[PDB]
DNA sequence: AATACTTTTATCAACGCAA
RNA sequence: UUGCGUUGAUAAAAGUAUUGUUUUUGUACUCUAGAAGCUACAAAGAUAAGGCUUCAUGCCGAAAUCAACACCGGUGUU
């Protein structure tokens, strides 16, 4: 086990920034609510197929108040659950036709689809139009790289995270870059102090070295991403020898053990820690660096 | 003195190097890269062409705004009511007077949904049923009838009639929309005199205007590398003209067309040679005298030598029958043209008429290649029209392909073919980076994306190892392209090196020992 | 902008530059320190970020022009993004460098609209200091009633006992000849 | 963000005629 | 290893059409001319965030290329 590995680095900058699917949100009270919250909506596309009935009864056996018709047209929902008592929607279609709504007469519109409160809002991009009333978002926003900062007045590391959608074609010359003020906002949100020293930046499959300060241990990782964007400095790592981290396998003293799933989501924003970056040759000759340059690369 | 070994996989190469007189490991390593997925280029291409479609729809609406503002009908476009029924005004303006703002509404709605034009198989049956309906009305009348009868207008939707059920669809040809717009514009011209005939020609150009599949994107001052207006300042005529292949031995010359005099006389010569007087006799007989065929050619070789056709060795067979022999089919078919014959014409003019007629597949490309490439040609319009109908008449014969040779090598070789019975590879036998290794061969010879990636990353490993340590004599690869590549580089660099074709590192170490 | 310890050093530097006795400054209306509290502020005692907003804005409004506070914000953006600047020089020296870069751009691009004058500064007792600083403005950017939108503020550190000349041409020649002595 | 059409150029295989 | 005649698989690039998602508005459905914005239908706008000049059959944006640094296709080190 004196074998050396050699990986390939992924540092391309203009990739898929998000989905192209335009989602809708509402503000409502669902579940264990003490206030309103924003909910990404969903839709059952058609209920008379085999999939739409299964999705309907899944939502119905989870929670009945998720449906928007349950809150905005209740008696029609009563005439929706009278069929599900005695049989289903396909049988009603092949006997009586389309499931119309409640009305005085038989002249209400037909019911083919149903919206509900799908989930809570996570990472998004606010693309709300001018004359709109609720929020309109784009989901599935991917991460690109990390910038690692370090301050001396606390003696610990802080970690940034840039996405693909944090860059822009600019307004005078059409170059692809991020400004310095938006970068100051991203530095402020991630908790980096203004007077920290920029150490290096990490792409995917970039070899990381973690050393300790009290008990002289050494661990080597591969960087993946900048997961869990609610509390700070958490980094997802991968092994150097294999492709996975299955089990509650121990790594070093101060980090801990991998979770039950197999994912290594650690917090490197702590004291008693030390980080180097490894730049291998194509034959595997590991060269260790401590300072990359003077400033992070922002113009491409 | 040292032996190199490589184990090549899909996304990994394991590599090792030994000494073989002692048998200790000098180096071992594992190089890991992601796989060459072709699903990402399909995703990127699909999105680019969808973005072009969205762009050109919006530009049609912008061009309609510019045309309507330049001719002075409407001043501003902010007070236009978006809550009027466009099909009602489109069917009303066929006989009545549209009030100058509902005309803009009708024309904008008509340019938003034009039709298909590939027609001039359930989907084919539904669009033919819809054409069978539109032979008596315009499509605006059909859409208004569907609207005020069934409530629905758009998509594909099925309706149960009194005794039958039929699925409807919103697909009409472009000719019907053009006829309806021409009728509406002539009636409003009879009413409102600000819509001159140049307005009608400009609007119909916006409506039925499409690009050609051999043009591409771009404009005269727009300079695309995906279209005919190349970014180097020039202008191609057909973008599939710089994609035609090279010659087999001189890799800087364009190929020849299969349907000319030169390739066809070369093919009949190659099937005849496996002497000179009866070569020329059979060739002028098949060239000038008609009602020809392969069985007729074997009857004629029974005729002139006056024997039964025996001692046959040089013949190709098909699965069905036999007597596959080359003929002057294209030459004899180019003789039934009512304009002047091709016998007493040049070989350069014949071959470039064959080029122009083989590559271009429809009227405007054929026409402007005949007008633009034949310098000072001064061709008439009658022969252009009959060559258009001639190319339309033979698509299976004339769009055959392109001959694998070039006109330079074949003009080097057509006289020589006759005097001796000799074959092509023996005839060509008889006529005959400064330290690092190239990326020429490994970027050209691509069988798959996966093989291309893995072999080029392995060759980077190879040349890094030969830079670091020194010379070699044995290189092992776990095919023949990389073999003769390395063998010719090492003979040209005067080095006798024999190249022969955790886990992968160990396996490369093992085969380096083997 | 951002209020931190670097703004405290910049405030104390420019106070030592324009006022010659410190009690001309810390007793101004709107600022209004006391002697023990001024010694608390000066000698590192009080944190500047939890003070009143109106007092710190009054100090910055007295010591700086309106365009100069914008240049403080832009130099703060550029300064905290580089380790050379952050680990070599303090913030007031880099603010001086930024200010003279803007002055040189003014002199290069449009030389024939640069005007200047003698600046006058009111003390705490109502009496002014005549000739406290040198005003440099662009004449095209005038608002009216003697106000200019783009205006900077310098101080000469020459060792010769000759004053700045008057007139547009003479003062422009003095500014172009003494570009290392003003600060 | 998916389903219908049209077209061009090129390369591998394998089935034969020859070397 | 090289040429010709058949038919399978693939790759790269081009031109079109109809929906889908989503926002406003109108009409219907519902509750008392107002309200709720569910459920349908129809117009108009957007369709990876964005950006350019030449003013238009306008154009670009989801792939591959890869260890860094210094001195004459080569040359030295952590």
Curated annotation (Swiss-Prot), chain A:
Biotechnology: The simplicity of the Cas9-gRNAs RNA-directed DNA endonuclease activity may be used to target and modify a DNA sequence of interest.
Oligomer status and interactors: Monomer. Binds crRNA and tracrRNA.
Domain description: Has 2 endonuclease domains. The discontinuous RuvC-like domain cleaves the target DNA noncomplementary to crRNA while the HNH nuclease domain cleaves the target DNA complementary to crRNA.
Family: Belongs to the CRISPR-associated protein Cas9 family. Subtype II-A subfamily.
Biological role stated in the UniProt entry: CRISPR (clustered regularly interspaced short palindromic repeat) is an adaptive immune system that provides protection against mobile genetic elements (viruses, transposable elements and conjugative plasmids). CRISPR clusters contain spacers, sequences complementary to antecedent mobile elements, and target invading nucleic acids. CRISPR clusters are transcribed and processed into CRISPR RNA (crRNA). In type II CRISPR systems correct processing of pre-crRNA requires a trans-encoded small RNA (tracrRNA), endogenous ribonuclease 3 (rnc) and this protein.
Protein name, as recorded: CRISPR-associated endonuclease Cas9 1
Organism: Streptococcus thermophilus (strain ATCC BAA-491 / LMD-9)
Gene name linked to the record: cas9-1
């Amino acid at each position: 086990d004196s074998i050396l590995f050699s990986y390939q680095v992924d540092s391309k900058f203009n990739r898929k920034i998000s989905d192209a699917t335009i989602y809708a949100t509402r503000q409502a009270k669902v579940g264990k609510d003490k206030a309103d919250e924003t909910y990404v909506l969903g839709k059952i596309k058609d209920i008379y197929t085999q999939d739409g009935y299964d999705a309907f009864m899944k939502i119905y056996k989870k929670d009945k108040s998720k449906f928007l018709m349950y809150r905005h047209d209740p008696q029609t929902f009563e005439k929706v659950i009278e069929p599900i008592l005695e049989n289903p929607f396909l049988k009603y279609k092949e006997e009586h036709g389309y499931i119309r709504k409640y009305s005085k007469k038989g002249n209400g519109p037909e019911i083919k689809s149903l919206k509900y409160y799908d989930s809570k809002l996570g990472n998004h991009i606010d693309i709300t139009p001018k004359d709109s009333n609720n929020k309109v978002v784009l989901q599935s926003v991917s991460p690109w790289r990390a910038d690692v900062y370090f301050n001396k007045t606390t003696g610990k590391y802080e970690i940034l995270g840039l996405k693909y959608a944090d860059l822009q074609f600019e307004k005078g010359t059409g170059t692809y870059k991020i400004s310095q003020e938006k970068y100051n906002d991203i530095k402020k949100k991630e908790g980096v102090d203004s007077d920290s020293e920029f150490k290096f930046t990490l792409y995917k499959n970039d070899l990381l070295l973690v050393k300790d300060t009290e008990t002289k241990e050494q661990q080597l990782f591969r960087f993946l991403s900048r997961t869990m964007p609610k509390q700070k400095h958490y980094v997802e790592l991968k092994p150097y020898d294999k492709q996975k981290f299955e089990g509650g396998e121990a790594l070093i003293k101060v980090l801990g053990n991998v979770a039950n799933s197999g994912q290594c989501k650690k917090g490197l924003g702590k004291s008693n820690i030390s980080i180097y970056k490894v730049r291998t040759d194509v034959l595997g000759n590991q060269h260790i660096i401590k300072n990359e340059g003077d400033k992070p690369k922002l113009d491409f | 003195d040292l032996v190199l070994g490589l184990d090549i996989g899909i996304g990994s190469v394991g590599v090792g190097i030994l000494n073989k007189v002692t048998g200790e490991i000098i180096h071992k390593n594992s190089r890991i890269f992601p796989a060459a997925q072709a699903e990402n280029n399909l995703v990127r291409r699909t999105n680019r062409q969808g973005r072009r479609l969205t762009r050109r729809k919006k530009h049609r609406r912008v061009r309609l705004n510019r045309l309507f503002e330049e001719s002075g009908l409407i001043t501003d476009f902010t007070k236009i009511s978006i809550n009027l029924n466009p099909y009602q005004l489109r069917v009303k303006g066929l006989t009545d007077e549209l009030s100058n703002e509902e005309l803009f509404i009708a024309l904008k709605n008509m340019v938003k949904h034009r039709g298909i034009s590939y027609l001039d198989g359930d989907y084919a049956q539904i669009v033919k049923e819809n054409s069978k309906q539109l032979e008596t009305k315009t499509p605006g009348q059909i859409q208004l009838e569907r609207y005020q009868t069934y409530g629905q207008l758009r998509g594909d939707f099925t309706v149960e009639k009194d005794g039958k059920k039929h699925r409807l669809i919103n697909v009409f040809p472009t000719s019907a929309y053009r006829s309806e717009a021409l009728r509406i514009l002539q009636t409003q011209q009879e009413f409102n005199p600000q819509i001159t005939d140049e307005f009608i020609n400009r609007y119909l150009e916006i409506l039925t205007g499409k690009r050609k599949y051999y043009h591409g994107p771009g404009n005269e001052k727009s300079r695309t590398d995906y279209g005919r207006y190349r970014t180097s300042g020039e202008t191609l005529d057909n973008i599939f003209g710089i994609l035609i292949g090279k010659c087999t031995f001189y890799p800087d010359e364009f190929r020849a067309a299969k349907a000319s005099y030169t390739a066809q006389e070369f093919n009949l010569l190659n099937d005849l040679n496996n002497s000179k007087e009866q070569k020329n006799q059979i060739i002028n007989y098949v060239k000038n005298e008609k009602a020809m065929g392969p069985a007729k050619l074997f009857k004629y070789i029974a005729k002139l030598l006056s024997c039964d056709v025996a001692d046959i060795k040089g013949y190709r067979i098909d699965k069905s029958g036999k007597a596959e022999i080359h003929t002057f089919e294209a030459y004899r078919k180019m003789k039934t043209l009512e304009t002047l014959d091709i016998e007493q014409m040049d070989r350069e003019t014949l071959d470039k008429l064959a080029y122009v007629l083989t590559l271009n597949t429809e009227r405007e490309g054929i026409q402007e290649a005949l007008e633009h490439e034949f310098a000072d040609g001064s061709f008439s319009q009658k022969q252009v029209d009959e060559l258009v109908q001639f190319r339309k008449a033979n698509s299976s014969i004339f769009g055959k392909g392109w001959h694998n040779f070039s006109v330079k090598l074949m003009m080097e070789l057509i006289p020589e073919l006759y005097e001796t019975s000799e074959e092509q590879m023996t005839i060509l036998t008889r006529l005959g980076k400064t330290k690092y290794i190239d990326e020429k061969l490994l970027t050209e010879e691509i069988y798959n994306p996966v093989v291309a990636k893995s072999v080029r990353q392995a060759i980077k490993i190879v040349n890094a190892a030969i830079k670091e340590y020194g010379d070699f004599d044995n290189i092992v690869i776990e095919s023949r392209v990389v073999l003769n590549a390395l063998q010719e580089h090492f003979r040209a660099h005067k080095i006798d090196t024999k190249v022969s074709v955790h886990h992968h590192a160990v396996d490369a170490l093992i085969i380096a020992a083997s | 902008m951002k209020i931190n310890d670097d703004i405290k050093e910049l405030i104390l530097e420019y106070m030592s530059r324009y006022f010659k006795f410190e009690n001309d400054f810390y007793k101004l209306p709107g600022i209004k320190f006391t002697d023990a509290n001024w010694q608390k502020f000066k000698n590192g005692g009080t944190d500047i970020e939890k003070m009143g907003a109106a007092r710190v804005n009054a100090m910055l409004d007295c010591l700086f022009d309106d365009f100069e506070l914008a240049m403080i914000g832009k130099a703060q953006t550029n300064y905290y993004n580089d380790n050379s600047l952050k680990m070599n020089m303090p913030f007031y020296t880099y603010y001086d460098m930024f200010k003279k870069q803007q002055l040189l751009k003014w002199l290069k691009n449009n030389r024939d609209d640069v005007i200047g004058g003698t600046g006058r500064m009111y003390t705490a007792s109502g009496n002014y200091i005549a000739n406290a600083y040198l005003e440099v403005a662009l004449e095209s950017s005038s608002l009216g009633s003697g106000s200019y939108m783009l205006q900077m503020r310098f101080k000469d550190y020459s060792k010769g006992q000759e004053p700045i000349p008057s007139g547009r041409q003479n003062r422009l020649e003095w500014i172009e000849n003494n570009l290392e002595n003003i600060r």
